[PDB]
Structures are given as C-alpha cells and as structure tokens.
Design a protein around this ligand. Structure first.
Ligand code: ATP
Ligand code: ATP
Ligand code: ATP
Lengths: 482, 466
C-alpha cells in the first residue's frame, strides 16, 4: 500500500478495474464472461509524478513481469527498421503468448511520451487480428489532446485516467512521506508543521513538493556551512498556478458606521446565497463615488465568504484586448465559475469593464451583452454562483437596464462627517497626536466630501512637507478637494 | 422490405435509383442507353445502425453476390504489398466479368470506416481505362469532409445520399441484443431499463454500446469482490385567471397550428414588462403542445458570438425545425438577440433581418411550424416594425392587487399562516405592482432575516420595488 501520496479513491477504482478482473481465480472471469482489458492510460499535468506511479503499479501487478522500458524516440534507426522494432517488443510477448496461451503468462509494457507506419503497427499488435491478450500496456503523457483518437476508443485502450494536481490532504500525503523519512532519523526542524505546509499550498504538482523540500535541505546545507521550508515558500516556486492582498492593499478600517452596515449586509448576502433554492443566482452591485473604496470592500466580502471557489475578475487583464477577445476571456472566467457548487465571482470597474466613455456616449456592445445575459443566464441546477459589481457611476448603469438585472443595490458614500474622518485618521495612524487634536478642532462646523482612496492619497501628500506645514497644507488641500 | 425502422423514404429512393436501372430486364438499359451506376454512397451520423443497412442493401441487390467484406486497415503491410491487395480484390471481380462480360454478373464489395498512390489506384479501379462496370461498391462514413475530392463528382460515385440523424430505435436494438444476453443469463440488473438507456444517450456510435456494456460488466465486477425541466426549475403557479388564460390561448394557437393546413405559421408573442415570468410561460406553452420537435433557443448559448455566428445558430435551429413535419419553436430574450440598448440606438440589424424575414418565411409544403417569442419592449418592437410581423399579441402582467399577492404567497407556501395574516393585513385594499420572479427573490430575501424580521423585511422590499 506504499508509497503514493493522495490518489487513494482514484487509485482504488483504477486498481480495482484493471487488476481485479485479472485477479479472481479462476471461474469468476468466465462467469463474468468478459474479455480482459487491453491497456490503461494515464495523462497528467507535468510534475504530477506519473513515472513512479507507473513503476510501482507495474511492480504491484506481478511478482515480476518483469518490466519493459521503451525509449521516448521509439522509432530511432532509419534503414528499415524501427517499425520492425515497435513490432518486436510486442513480438516477444506474443511469442510467449502463442507458446503458453490459456494460462498463465503476464507481460507488462509501458510506453513513455506516447506518424505514418507506427500508428498502424502498434494499433495492430495491441488489438487483433487474433488474440494478443494476456498483456497490458500503459502510456504516460503530459497532454491528452496530442494523443491519437484511435487508441482512445474502447478496446485496446478502453480506460483513460486523468490525474488531478494533489489535494491539500493529498499534498499533505506527499510532503508527509519525505517529512516522515526525515522524521525517522533524528534530525528535523521543530518550526515546520505539516498542517501549516498543507494549508499554505493548494496549487502544487507533486514534483513541486519534493523539489521544495529538497531545496530546503540545500538551504540547511548552506546553514551548516518555517525555517528552510519557509525560505522555499518564499522562493522555490515557480508553481505555475486569487490574490486579495493585491486588492486590499489598504485595510477595511472601521472608519464608519456605513462600513459596518455594508459589511453586515454582505453577511446577509452570503447567508442569502447559502441555500437560495428558489433563486439560483445571486447578483449584487456596489454604486459609489470615485475613490469609494468599494473594491476593497468587495475583495473583503469575497475573502470573508470563503466559498470553495472564489476568483477575482480583473479589468487590468482585459486592457488592450480586442473587444471580442475581451468577451472571450470573460466567458472563459464564467465557465470556470461553473465547477463549484457554491461560488463567488467579482466584477470590477464595470464602467471601465464596458469600455464606456462619457462622450457619445460611445460603448462596447458585445461586452455588455455577455454581462447582461449572465445574470439572466442560469448555472446548472445544484451548482450556484454570486455576482458582485463595483460601479463608479450609477445612472448610466441604471440606463443600460443593468440596474434592472441586479438583485440588490448597495451604496457606500464618502464620509460627510469630520469626526468620522478623524476616526479614520486615527485608524491609519500617520500624523502625530498634536496634529490629531488640531484636525479635530478644524473639522467641526465643516462638511467633508472625500473618497477613502482619495483620502489615503491626500494624507500621504500632506505628510511629505515639514511638520509646521502639514496641518495647513492638508487643511487647504481638503478645502480645494471639497 | 425488412428490416429497417424508419428510413423508408431515403431507402425507397436509393434502392430505386441503384437497383431499378440494373434490375429491369433486358432491353431497358439499351432503350435508356444509359450506363449502369458504378456505385452508391451514403454518409451518416454515428449510432445510425449502419452495418445492418449495408448488409440489407447488399443482400437485396443479389441472390448472392456473395458479400465481400473489407477490413478497416485495408492497406496493412507497407513493403509491397497492400497495393497488390487493393488492386486484387477488385481484380477478382474484373476477372469474372472479363470472363463473362456482356451479361449478367454483378459483384458487391463494401469497405467499412474508410493517400498517395492509393487515391489514384482506387479511382483507376472504379473507373477506366476500359469498362470496369458490372460491379458496385458502397462506402458508408461518419464524417463527409475527411473523404477524397475526386469521388464526389457524378460518375464513379455519382450520387451521394445522407441518412437522417440516427433513430434511437436502432440504438435500443444494439443495446437490446447485449441486454438480451444478460436477460438470457440468469444474472441481470433490475435498475437497467432498455427504455431508460435508449432515452439518455443520443450522440453515441455503435461500438459505444458494446463499450458501455463492458463498463457495466466492470462495475458489476467491482460490486462482487434540450431539457424542459432545467429551464423552469420553479414550476408554475396559477394565482390568477389571466395566468391560466395565457396557457389556454397558447394551447389554442397550438391546436390551430397542428390542425389547420391553411396557415403554415403562427407567431406567438408575449407582452410583459420585466422582470416578467413570461419566458417561462412560453416554454410551458411549448411543453403543452407535445410537438414532435420542440426546441427552445437560449441567448447564453449564443453568448459572446459575433453577429454572423448568432445568425448562423438561428439558421441552424430553424432549419432543423424545417426537416420535421411540424414543430414549435420558442424564442427568448428577443431584445437581446437583437442586442437592443436604449442608448444609441445600438442594435444588430443583420439579426433583425434574419429573424424578421424567416418569420415571414414558411417551410416547404406539407409542413407547418409555430414560433413563440418573449419581448421586453412591445413598444420598441412595434417601433422596429417587427411586431407587425408577429401573427398575434398576448400580454402578461405583473400582479396588481393584494389579493393576487396572497394567492401567490399561498401557492408557493413559504410564509406562515401568521406571516400571511400580517402581510394580508398590510396589503389588502392597497395597490401593488411587482413581477413574479423578483417576488420569488424577495421571499428568499426575507427568509434570511430572523423569524420576526421576516415580515418587516418583506414589506420593506415591497416598499422598495414600488
Ligand atoms: N503527487 C505526487 N506523487 C508522487 N510523486 C510526485 C507528486 N508530485 C510530484 N512528484 C515528483 O514527480 C516524480 C514523478 O512524477 P513525474 O514528475 O515523473 O510526473 P510527470 O507527469 O512525468 O512530470 P513531467 O511531465 O513534468 O515529466 C517523483 O520523482 C516525485 O518526486
Ligand atoms: N474595506 C476597505 N475596502 C476598500 N478599501 C479600504 C478598506 N479599508 C481601507 N481601504 C483603503 O481604501 C482605499 C480603497 O479605495 P479603492 O481605490 O480600492 O476603491 P475603488 O473602487 O478603486 O475607487 P475608484 O474605482 O473610484 O478608484 C485604499 O486606500 C485601500 O487600501
Ligand atoms: N406563477 C408563475 N408564473 C410564471 N413563472 C413563475 C410563477 N411562479 C414562479 N415562477 C418562476 O419564476 C422564474 C422566472 O423565470 P423566467 O426567467 O422565465 O422569467 P422571465 O419573464 O423569462 O424573466 P425576464 O423578464 O428577465 O425574461 C422561473 O423560475 C419561473 O418558473
């Protein structure tokens, strides 16, 4: 039962289907009256550690086949020739088979990196004309699509298996074996925790794990002449595969009662999603003054919900794309949303997303159509999705029937109160405590109309000039901004 | 005349054209002075029960040909060799014919599951240099485009006939033999039903059936050691007589359409202001018809498409409707297909023309079809001049009285007797105006609040959607 991290459900099924039909002795097969499977093929993303699995599986099936290995080129040697060779490794098995056919000979052949003559030659040997059973062949390849259709068909390669990147629990299994090997000998790093490593990594192919640990070992070697694992997390991948930290640079500071009302309302919306059998799709939008901080809030709502799949959609990625191309990427995101039973998606800068321009007005029809249809569009029954839109300008959106589409509308107004502004200032903690008092003295009797994004920028702008200057400059700046 | 279910029309024409000119004895070919057809070709979709049909045709042509079977690979053995084989099977027919050429020998050869030298080699055998007539070869294949160019033209394979999309019945037959084998053995699965199995799968090739069976055997082995429903998940309430009345009027349109020859087409238009539930009502109308082919087209299916592509989809669906004797077609989000935007105006004209023209257009004689559309903006549509094109106008309205409201809350059964007792006490006598779906939404928006904040939140929502 060792060793292979994760892939136990998949392993159990695959194992059962290929091996069990062979294993039952001996009447069971005739009672079934079903011919033995010819081959099993596994296709995986690179770094999924296919080879070890194949050697192990082959080893597991027979005491000794004993294993046959084929070079990747396969058809090397021009004169005759290679075709004959492709015929030949099969040929040994078939010879054994003609010599003993009935019972009990098994040969294991594996093809790594699986046109003209070779397609037919292999296809002919694996199935037909007569017999050719009592042997199995496994092909390991990075891409399914590359491979030939004929093999795919039931028969010669009836079953094709796809290996997902290891699960967090699975990831824990792969890390767990290397860690365990390190565990058995006395030396270890106390700081490192298996659970912590597992929670930290979602994306990684197997390979990634052995690689990171090995690299950590190298850093440790360097040390001799968290810890090393933490350093590997810091660098090593290169993983190749949702950052909220890029959308909440600045904190959901509790500047105001409005912040709380919007968030509690967000909780009402997630709660609303949780069941929602009567209504499948959840649509929410945020309408705010520019520099509203609406997007920080939306990102925070997505983080708070923690639905199994939450993916941000970004305006920034769309830039410079053909309008049709913009639609295409967008649709692609939409289908990606489908897989989770419960799911959250973000629409940001919709005025920007649309490519809407105030003069004209001139705007992109196709993007608008994708947006318009999806809220009406229904995810398959069972699986569900919630939609969040951030809009700088409300009226235009109302105008394109977009408002009509959304289930709920929320407002996140700029603070109109000097004291709330003061509270926000305290939360940001930038200027000194004398300054806090002076600002507090100035705000009373005055009305403030400024966005938080704008506000952070304003504070920062006032700060660079010298201390006597900062109070006056900031007040004057506020006056101008007003 | 047996056995092949359906495919009597295609069969009748095909048998006649290939077989009748040869069959007629004997002055007829000369009196006609027309050369016998070299071959007949059929191209078909997977799961069509092809092998049996080919067997039947070959059997039908001669008392005994007697049948020639060609292996799928055909050309196996590169070295000499294959070329000799491809030339050779033809060669035998040629030998018999040269030996007796004049009258009266016919040989039938069939190649299953269809370049360089072989292209020319086959063309040469089928036609020329001299004669090579008095034999026929039929090729049956899943995809048209793959096969060679030289062939299509009148002559070697002058007529190519395409079978209609595969009958389930055959699929049921191929499955039926394997199922029968399991029936035959004592062992069987209670859960498997021939009817269920046939109904779930459409696309699949023959091959696929025995394959599925192998998989079922494997599962047993493991043990020993176009949807109507999805579209309308909610189902339909009947709060008001108008609501019943639209279904009755719709049913009447269907009756008219199916029963009467005089109008090939009727156009069904639903007038509602969104968020109306009318789209659903239209789908329902289609369901009640029980028409042989009813297809509902969804904009999302067309989402992100270029104008031309949407139009092509429309053409495909509608053309699909033409082939059937009669059909019901439901059109949804008519504004969206149009891509009307109130600003502008911006809309796609080309689509407007395709739909509007087709709407006037009628299928070839002996067939009739029914078109149903959902429109947000009857006024805007009339402004286009498209509304005039539609045969009939039907209007579906949002609730207007407190009474329709409680009847709906009751039919849905979400709120308590108490809840409904408070709501009625807050609406009865007053005036309301809210579409059905938002209501179904607000309902969910109120169940999210605590058991005591539900009434207030509900009434708050209804206070906003005014
Ligand atoms: N989940 C995993 N299980 C087992 N081995 C893994 C896993 N992830 C990575 N590996 C590593 O990968 C090796 C075997 O998988 P391998 O990388 O060969 O798969 P692959 O599909 O051939 O990858 P590639 O396509 O990049 O060559 C092992 O040496 C192991 O260290
Ligand atoms: N809950 C929160 N949400 C968003 N931003 C917050 C929060 N707490 C603090 N901030 C800070 O407030 C500002 C967020 O404004 P942001 O620019 O993200 O809004 P926006 O939608 O981009 O406005 P606009 O689109 O009009 O530029 C940043 O300084 C951010 O780091
Ligand atoms: N009494 C009712 N009549 C019609 N539909 C109802 C009723 N009660 C609930 N529904 C449901 O309300 C939902 C409305 O769905 P649908 O999108 O078809 O409405 P629609 O009018 O097409 O919306 P739109 O106006 O955006 O086109 C469906 O789940 C439908 O089954």
């Amino acid at each position: 039962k060792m060793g292979i991290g994760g892939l136990d459900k998949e392993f159990s099924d695959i194992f059962r289907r290929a091996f069990a039909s062979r294993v039952f002795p001996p009447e069971i097969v005739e009672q079934m009256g079903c011919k033995h499977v010819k081959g099993i093929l596994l296709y995986g993303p690179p770094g999924c550690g296919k080879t070890l699995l194949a050697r192990q599986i082959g080893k597991m099936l027979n005491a000794r086949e004993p294993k046959v290995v084929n070079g990747p080129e396969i058809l090397n040697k021009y004169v005759g020739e290679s075709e004959a060779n492709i015929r030949k490794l099969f040929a040994d098995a078939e010879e054994e088979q003609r010599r003993l056919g009935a019972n009990s000979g098994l040969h294991i052949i594996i093809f790594d990196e699986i046109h003209d003559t070779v397609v037919n030659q292999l296809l002919s040997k694996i199935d037909g004309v007569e017999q050719l059973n009592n042997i199995l062949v496994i092909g390991m390849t990075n891409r399914p699509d590359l491979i030939d259709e004929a093999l795919l068909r039931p028969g010669r390669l009836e079953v094709k298996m796809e290996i997902g990147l290891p699960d967090e629990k699975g990831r824990l299994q792969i890390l767990h074996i290397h860690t365990a090997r390190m565990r058995g000998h006395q030396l270890l790093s106390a700081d490192v925790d298996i659970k912590e490593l597992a929670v930290e990594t979602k994306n990684f192919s197997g390979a990634e794990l052995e690689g990171l640990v090995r690299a950590a070992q190298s850093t440790a070697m360097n040390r001799h002449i968290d810890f090393l694992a933490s350093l590997e997390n810091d660098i090593k991948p290169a993983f190749g595969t949702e950052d909220y930290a890029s959308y909440i640079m600045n904190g959901i500071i509790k500047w105001g009662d409005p912040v709380t009302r919007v968030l509690d309302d967000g909780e009402l919306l997630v709660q609303q999603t949780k069941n929602s059998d009567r209504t499948p799709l959840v649509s929410v939008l945020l309408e705010g003054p520019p520099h509203s901080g609406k997007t920080a809030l939306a990102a925070k709502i997505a983080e708070e919900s923690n639905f199994p799949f939450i993916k941000i959609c970004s305006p920034d990625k769309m830039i410079g794309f053909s309008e049709t191309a913009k639609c295409q990427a967008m649709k692609k995101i939409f289908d990606d949303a489908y897989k989770s039973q419960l799911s959250c998606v973000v629409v940001d800068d919709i005025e920007r997303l649309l490519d809407y321009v105030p003069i004209g007005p001139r705007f992109s029809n196709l993007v608008l159509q994708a947006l318009l249809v999806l809220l009406k569009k229904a995810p398959p029954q069972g699986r569900k999705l919630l939609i969040i839109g951030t809009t700088s300008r409300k009226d235009v959106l109302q105008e394109m029937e977009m408002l009509n589409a959304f289930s709920t509308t929320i407002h996140v107004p700029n603070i109109a109160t000097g004291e709330q502004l003061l509270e926000a200032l305290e939360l940001l903690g930038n200027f000194k405590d004398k300054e806090r008092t002076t600002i507090a003295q100035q705000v009373k009797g005055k009305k403030v109309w400024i966005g938080i994004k704008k506000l952070l920028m304003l504070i920062e702008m006032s700060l660079q000039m010298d201390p006597e200057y900062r109070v006056r400059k900031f007040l004057a700046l506020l006056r101008e901004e007003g």
